[PDB]
């Protein structure tokens, strides 16, 4: 990454073994559950395109997803080149391939990122990557919100957990449906409570 | 490695126990799966030839691979000496053996790496090593892409994972074949979808 030092200057630092291992382990354990994306974003704080490519490349398996990610990056890079049609010792303008780190060196990336004003190629590339990861989350979301219905004896709290877990995954890239998909006994209670009830009030009502 | 300090100067640092252990553990667990190479590259960021030799030497077993790696390094070193035919207190020019760290001391390596302009012997040697590691990945790749065919009941997503995992390993040192190696039911769907479909669109189509 690029971070501050004692002199207050932005300097490059090696990606740490802790960071490398944390990303490998979250992918292994969580695959492409929605919560993997904010973890990726947090672990790649201040990342250069090189660092982002390092993290993506350290992933073994999940290569269908990684290929979809390549497609998304290709699309975002093409759009950048469309919108940005591009001297000794002077800073050139970054193309899509430079932002994605295929045609740019680490030193060029540092030059752009620490310039005044800065050209944040690390943040731009992360945006494309996060866009692609969100599509993968949506692709691998197993259940439609329409099929999340409360069981006859399922506690309301457990149903609400399933409901909003499903909604999170499905929307990666409500109040009335929650009530409609509730079981007969809680639906009766929720109808009597009426519209305008908070989730807390609904959960309290069907708790007993 | 060589890294920056508060004074903004490039100074040598000891390879850390975290780094040493991480490399030992990734080789133990992953052997020579493709994702081991970017991990090696990341863990050896700013590495001197001495550091690179340390990492390579800490590996127990896998000595067939390590011997192939020696051969590759010998080849790259020979080419360097061919292309670069080589005073009190003055900096000598590095030969192949100096880059590989057999005939150069740690202080000579630091001298070359921190010079202005710098002679990045650490990066040159890493290039040779990564070249050799890629050949080993290719050698130990168990399956040809021609033998990755979708099973009668295998979900398309799982097939695509196998397809691109195999392709990654085989190419270490497509769109039409993916369709041809699909099973009858998905092949029919993919034919109807037609060429020009993205991987995402293909996976969506054969998902049901």
């Amino acid at each position: 990454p690029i971070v501050q030092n004692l002199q207050g200057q932005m300097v490059h630092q090696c990606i740490s073994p802790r960071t490398l291992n944390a990303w490998v382990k979250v992918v292994e354990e969580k695959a492409f559950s929605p919560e993997v994306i904010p973890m990726f974003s947090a672990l790649s704080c201040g990342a250069t395109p090189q660092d982002l490519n390092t993290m993506l490349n350290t992933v073994g398996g999940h290569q269908a997803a990684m290929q979809m990610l390549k497609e998304t990056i290709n699309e975002e890079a093409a759009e950048w080149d469309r919108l940005h049609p591009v001297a000794p010792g002077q800073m050139r303008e970054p193309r899509g391939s430079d932002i994605a780190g295929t045609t740019s060196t680490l030193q060029e990336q540092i030059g752009w990122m620490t310039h005044n004003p800065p050209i944040p190629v690390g943040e731009i590339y992360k945006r494309w990557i996060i866009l692609g990861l969100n599509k993968i989350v949506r692709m691998y979301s197993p259940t439609s919100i329409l099929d999340i219905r409360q069981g006859p004896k399922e506690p309301f709290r457990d149903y609400v957990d399933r409901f909003y877990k499903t909604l999170r995954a499905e929307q990666a890239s409500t109040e009335t449906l929650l009530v409609q998909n509730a079981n007969p006994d809680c639906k009766t209670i929720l109808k009597a409570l009426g519209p305008g009830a908070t989730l807390e009030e609904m959960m309290t009502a069907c708790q007993g | 490695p060589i890294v920056q300090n508060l004074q903004g100067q490039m100074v040598h640092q000891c390879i850390s126990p975290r780094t040493l252990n991480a490399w030992v553990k990734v080789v133990e667990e992953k052997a020579f799966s493709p994702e081991v190479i970017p991990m090696f590259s990341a863990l050896s960021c700013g590495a001197t030839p001495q550091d690179l030799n340390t990492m390579l030497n800490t590996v127990g077993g896998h000595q067939a691979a390590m011997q192939m790696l020696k051969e590759t390094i010998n080849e790259e070193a020979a080419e360097w000496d061919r292309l670069h035919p080589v005073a009190p207190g003055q900096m000598r020019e590095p030969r192949g053996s100096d880059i590989a760290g057999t005939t150069s001391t740690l202080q000579e390596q630091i001298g070359w790496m921190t010079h202005n302009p710098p002679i990045p012997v650490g990066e040159i040697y890493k290039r040779w090593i990564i070249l050799g590691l890629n050949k080993i990945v290719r050698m130990y790749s168990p399956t040809s892409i021609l033998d990755i065919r979708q099973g009668p009941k295998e979900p398309f997503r799982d097939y695509v994972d196998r397809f691109y995992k195999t392709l990654r390993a085989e190419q270490a040192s497509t769109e039409t074949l993916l369709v041809q190696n699909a099973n009858p039911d998905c092949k029919t769907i993919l034919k109807a979808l037609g060429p020009g479909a993205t991987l995402e669109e293909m996976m969506t189509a054969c998902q049901g």
């Binding site: 395109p49 090189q50 982002l52 490519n53 390092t54 993506l56 490349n57 990684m66 290929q67 390549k70 990056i73 290709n74 890079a77 093409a78 899509g96 391939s97 994605a100 780190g101 295929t102 045609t103 | 970017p38 691109y164 392709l167 990654r168 085989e170 190419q171 497509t174 769109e175």
Partner: peptide, 14 residues
């Protein structure tokens, strides 16, 4: 394209 099937992220082209 910037990236091709079966090639690493960051892979230089040509």
């Amino acid at each position: 394209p910037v990236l091709f099937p079966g090639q690493p992220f960051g892979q230089p082209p040509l």
